[PDB]
Amino acid sequence: ASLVASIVEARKKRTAKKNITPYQRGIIRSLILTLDCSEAMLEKDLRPNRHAMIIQYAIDFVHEFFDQNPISQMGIIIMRNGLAQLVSQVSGNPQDHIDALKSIRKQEPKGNPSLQNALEMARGLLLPVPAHCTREVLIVFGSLSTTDPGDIHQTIDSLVSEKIRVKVLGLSAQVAICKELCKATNYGDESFYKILLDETHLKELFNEAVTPLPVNKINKGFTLVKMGFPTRIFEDTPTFCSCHSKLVYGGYFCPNCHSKVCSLPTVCPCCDLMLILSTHLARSYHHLMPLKTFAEVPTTEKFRSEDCFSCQSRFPILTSSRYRCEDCKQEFCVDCDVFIHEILHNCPGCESKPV
């Protein structure tokens, strides 16, 4: 009787994903993850302790964020002992923040949090940020309270005025002030103050936070942006780099001012212009071109085919596991459905079918 429970669970899951929309979603991102390292995360209540798992999950989050969206800079400020401590400036290299987080590994989480100080200096760090960049902050929190020097509502008003959004991933339960932050910052939405139920749910939440977010019509910033593809050289001689001032065998060359750099996707240090590859911009095209869900045909009706169109395996036989791409009119197995919907980003049935 487990298949009926699985079916009704899949129905209640798919009721949320019935509506799939091609919203304009931010690509030039600006993501900040502040960390609290206080007495609360010293609890071993989840194995091994909250501090260790948020360290590991932040490592994964950095990797996933830079993989999916390499067109953003990442800054991390830790919270400790009534002080918020900047440990990671916004940068194109994830490895810097990886090393900073590795430093955060060995140190000891202790103290009390101050979202006022944390968000204030996060605002100040987010101040010299260009218009197209979408300023947004992830906040992790384990306390049920917050010691603060002054008002939080002035900070809330300033953050709303400066067009920065937040998303809170609280640990224990809901905190009303964090709900207020999420609602007021997020145009009244309640889809940003999220509480886990276990570590797997925390993993899923982090994966959810990886994704780009849609933007609002009223928050209109539709413009152009100057861009430059550089050229890579492979020279015999080591050559001084502009950024780190040291001898480099290879390195890309600046398209505009003909200097050289060491890493991409990065902006020029000399002509001060952003340099990318077409792979980097095409990386988010699945977000730009979403994929429709695939429908299982019912077991009662007559079937177009009895084996999987894509992976080429036999469909198993009570119910019918034939997920149909209505855009290509072909049914598929669950494994192929998962792979095409998540790993792949094209429908080979729609590739074979001519338009």
Add this chain to the structure above:
Amino acid sequence: IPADFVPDSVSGMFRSHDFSYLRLRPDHASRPLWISPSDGRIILESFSPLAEQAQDFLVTIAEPISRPSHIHEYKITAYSLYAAVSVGLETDDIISVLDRLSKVPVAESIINFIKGATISYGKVKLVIKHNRYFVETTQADILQMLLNDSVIGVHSFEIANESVEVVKKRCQEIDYPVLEEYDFRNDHRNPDLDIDLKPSTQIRPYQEKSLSKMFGNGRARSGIIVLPCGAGKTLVGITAACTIKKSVIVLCTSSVSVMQWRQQFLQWCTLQPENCAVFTSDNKEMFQTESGLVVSTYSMVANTRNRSHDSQKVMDFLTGREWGFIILDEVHVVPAAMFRRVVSTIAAHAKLGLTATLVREDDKIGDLNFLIGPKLYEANWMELSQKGHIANVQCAEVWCPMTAEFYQEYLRETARKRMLLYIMNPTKFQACQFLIQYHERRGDKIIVFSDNVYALQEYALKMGKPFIYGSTPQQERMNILQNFQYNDQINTIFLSKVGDTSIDLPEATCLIQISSHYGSRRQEAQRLGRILRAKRRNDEGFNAFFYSLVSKDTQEMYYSTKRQAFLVDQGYAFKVITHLHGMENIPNLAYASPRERRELLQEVLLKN
């Protein structure tokens, strides 16, 4: 054998052990039970269904031989089947449930064994009417056969109190066992004691199971209840007394235990300190109330060498009182010859036995069947360890490499002094010093156990922290105990056979053994139970630490193996450590220089 069972070429060492002649049921996936008919053993899976329902049934009708995490080795015994039918169970139901949950066909010998181990339950009973052991059986059919027996010499007749133990052994021998289920509600000949279960006491589930197994009919079934260290046996006895509401006497084998159980009893039951009169050489007062209690250890009833007249008056008073309930806490010592006068002296109806270990060197532990009765309940030790009712220990057995400095004299020493000569190794002193350093570095209270007072005091003096043994007076030992508990000057202490058992010292999560008995497993088991009742047995990431410094190149390895094998079979393993940690990182080592080693060698040569 449900087969021809032609002997296989690989069954040669399987001396009737190749158990593949059985026709395994296709329901072997669901059913958790095998039967081993060669030795009566039972093989039980810990990963197949019906085991949760069958666990209590297998405890009731069978004894476990070994219970690791994967496969429980049980064994049906006639003792366990008598315990089953005493709880209230029968052969046919046992056979039916066994075939219901058994992967294998039920063996003929096991069927016959359970058929034989069915008692005349209810036929043979005894009651006390005004301190008189009246053998009240339901029929004269019992009277005919019992008078047919030559030992004896509805209807009730007298058997003398010392003759009661002998005739109970005899009727167990002729398999006509007596049940002692007091109708304390129906009997009002004894003075009822107005003691109530306070709402401040609420009972653990396994303790409720222990009560209801011996309170199935509402009467108090008499026997043994074996519970681990710190399980709440005092709470179980308090609950039994409060639901019996009669005159009750409980004896434990320490005056410290007398003090602690008296305060426990006046704490968690509504009996009054007036009703409780404590008997010892401190004071021999009596309560004058119709109902109440008098507590003493077993010594003030056993002894007749140096007795006071007030002691004589008190033992006369307790002889006069016809009690309704008796509990012999730490029941492992009462079947000793100077201690088994309990039936001969005390007139008490219900006989319950609460202890941690149900093992000893000889077979006096089975005498409790005809002294107090069978085991009414036991709690599974690893189940309570995972439940947090008892602790989880990372025991680390330290194989100290033997120094030739002491071995050269140890080999030529005479036998009575070889022991004290190989206890005192300078390498062992070095290892103990760094271990104390390392666990005070970890911040653990450490208790050191030595079997010899001189070794205990030498280790204590080399530490610079005091010692407690059996010859130390009570006032000095409690002063040292409170100094250890509260004073930070006394970080560790040096305990002995007054610390091995019958005390409440659970703070020491770290324990280092430098010496022990020759082969007494119960002393080592009680030493393990000293830290098994530790307070932080419930917090996450906890593992208690047990250490045994044993000299190599001796028989002490086999001695420690013998002393530890019960705990290993329980589930408390003894891991191998020979090359220790931090052996030279410690700067100062006790008797490190060879001149210091020869110094201590000739110092102990002064005695050996």
Add this chain to the structure above:
Amino acid sequence: IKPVFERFSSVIITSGTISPLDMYPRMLNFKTVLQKSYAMTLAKKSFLPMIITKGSDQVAISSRFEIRNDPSIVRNYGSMLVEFAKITPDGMVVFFPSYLYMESIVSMWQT
């Protein structure tokens, strides 16, 4: 209530925590035309009542003024007060039966 009842007929007596209904016409000489309540037609559980009959050490607790200065009952009271304070996110209220009972027990937890 006699001037009220004999001056006005269209009088509605209702509340949220009146139980049993008949006890108020029992204590006051009046009668009503219909006596019924309303059940909570709830989709899912939203209120979780507990009856703490025993402390952390399985020790019962009561508010009786004789046993009022019991240190063990104090220990239990402060115990779950601390625990609920630690797990309570936003706002929690405490309701003792009497002010003197408070003043005693708060002064000695202050101790």
